[PDB]
Paper text:
One protein family common to humans, C. parvum and in fact all eukaryotes is the group of tyrosine 3-monooxygenase/tryptophan 5-monooxygenase activation proteins (YWHA), also known as 14-3-3 proteins. All 14-3-3 proteins are dimers, with each subunit comprised of nine α-helices framing a peptide-binding cleft. The dimer is shaped like the letter “W” from one angle, with an un-partitioned bicameral pocket where a substrate protein is held at two typically phosphorylated sites in the two component clefts. The parasite Cryptosporidium parvum has three 14-3-3 proteins: Cp14ε, Cp14a and Cp14b, with only Cp14ε similar to human 14-3-3 proteins in sequence, peptide-binding properties and structure.
Structurally, Cp14a features the classical 14-3-3 dimer but with a uniquely wide pocket and a disoriented RRY triad potentially incapable of binding phosphopeptides. Cp14a shares limited sequence identity with Cp14ε and all other known proteins. First, while the Cp14a structure also adopts the classic dimeric α-helical structure, it stands out by virtue of its unusual width. More strikingly, Cp14a is further distinguished by the natural absence of a C-terminal tail ensuing the last helix. Even the second arginine and the ensuing tyrosine are skewed in their orientations with respect to what is typical in other 14-3-3 proteins, with or without ligands bound. This is the first known instance of a disoriented 14-3-3 triad (superposed on Cp14ε for comparison in Fig. 4D). The mode of dimerization of Cp14a deviates from that of other 14-3-3 proteins. While the two subunits form an aperture similar to that in the human 14-3-3 proteins and Cp14ε, the side chain interactions around the aperture are primarily hydrophobic, with Cys26 and Met70 of opposite chains occupying the position of the Arg-Glu salt bridge conserved in most other homologs. One intuitive conclusion is that this protein supports a large substrate; however, its disoriented Arg-Arg-Tyr triad, the lack of a C-terminal tail and our negative screening results make this C. parvum chaperone even more divergent from others and introduces the possibility that this is a degenerate 14-3-3 protein, or at least one that is functionally unique.
Residue numbers in the entry:
A (entry chain A), B (entry chain A): 8 to 227
């Protein structure tokens, strides 16, 4: 066990203990080590990275809502209300800081495999949606990152099976329903569908035909 | 609003946000301020103090049990198990440190009212039970603190109504069921009962008679 494996273990154990700030410190070390050695993350490392932001955001939401709920039930205590507001503001400043640091890390992810390139853009897209909500980026800049991930997917139909189908569906869903690209997405996926139909036709192996069909169906 | 009131507010707000370590820092400041001014805690300050230890202990228990549960479900990963054990040990060391610091604070509580004297001993008793479990005190030393609180209660039957009835019942319950003083406790409470019967007999006011009866019944 070297430092990189230790940090995977520490990140998991901190996640189990609900210590998301210590988990993030271990992940920062993973990012640095992988970058230093120019060695792509494995899937367990990627999963811990996305769990970290999920948890930090969820905590922020819970803590904020708990304080605001209690604030409103205090009758006529202007001073206590001000303390609640100050605390709520600090929590928001801290989550914004977290998003900035986490995004620094994600930008430094090593890319080699097709999935690693798509993964970086997917996670950057996810970050941009939080940054949109929290006053850290424009709608234009957020949309652009989602478009970049969708473009990469569509430029390499031969490698579609290297990507999780749910990532594909969520990106399609977000771009069409939230960014007003329903027409672009339907058109691009129509084309991707045809390319997969051909892949299926040309694939001799019956089990492989069925595997590609999962994506073809998933895309419709 | 002065610093002492601010810290009451900060302690409450940190409790609402589930930030028990920040809550404890605010309480440490309350303790120092009250000690400095020789000015007894009010009941809201006392309640925040006992909430703090309740929460810290509950968190420790949850975090420990979560990590141990996951540890056992990993098949053959000796290195990850060792990391889990190291983390579990650190959490225990930290809760022990917390108990030491919290006990320092409680020892520095200002005493003036009868209830403030009983409260200090009651909280010290509660701390001693955790310290017993965590290897920080002997059974003898824990028992002694519980006896000191029970003695104070019994030496001042005229002031019984200044104490919460549940505190009295819990102390009686603990001393008789956990410290093998069933005989002492039954005897002392028999005597306290008789003193309250007399107080009731001698109290002209009917509403006051009923108020004392609540304690007389509670004690049986």
């Amino acid at each position: 066990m070297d430092e990189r494996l230790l940090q995977k273990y520490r990140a998991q154990v901190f996640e189990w203990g609900g210590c998301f700030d210590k988990m993030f410190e271990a992940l920062k070390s993973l990012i640095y080590l992988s970058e230093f050695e120019n060695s792509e993350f494995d899937d367990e490392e990627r999963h811990l990275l996305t769990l970290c932001i999920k948890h930090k955001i969820s905590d922020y939401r819970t803590m904020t809502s708990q304080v605001l709920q209690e604030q409103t039930k205090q009758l006529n205590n202007d001073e206590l209300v001000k303390i609640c507001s100050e605390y709520v503001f600090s929590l928001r400043k801290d989550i914004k800081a977290f998003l900035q640091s986490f995004e620094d890390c994600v930008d430094r992810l090593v890319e080699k495999s097709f999935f690693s390139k798509f993964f970086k853009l997917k996670v950057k897209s996810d970050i941009s949606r939080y940054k949109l909500e929290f006053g850290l980026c424009s709608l234009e800049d957020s949309k652009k990152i989602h478009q970049d991930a969708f473009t990469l997917l569509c430029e390499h139909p031969d490698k579609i099976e290297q990507l999780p189908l749910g990532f594909i569906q969520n990106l399609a869903y977000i771009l069409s329903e939230k960014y007003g690209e329903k027409k672009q997405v339907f058109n691009m996926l129509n084309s991707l569908g045809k390319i997969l139909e051909l892949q299926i036709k040309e694939q001799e192996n019956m089990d492989r035909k069925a595997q590609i069909t999962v994506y073809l169906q998933g895309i419709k």
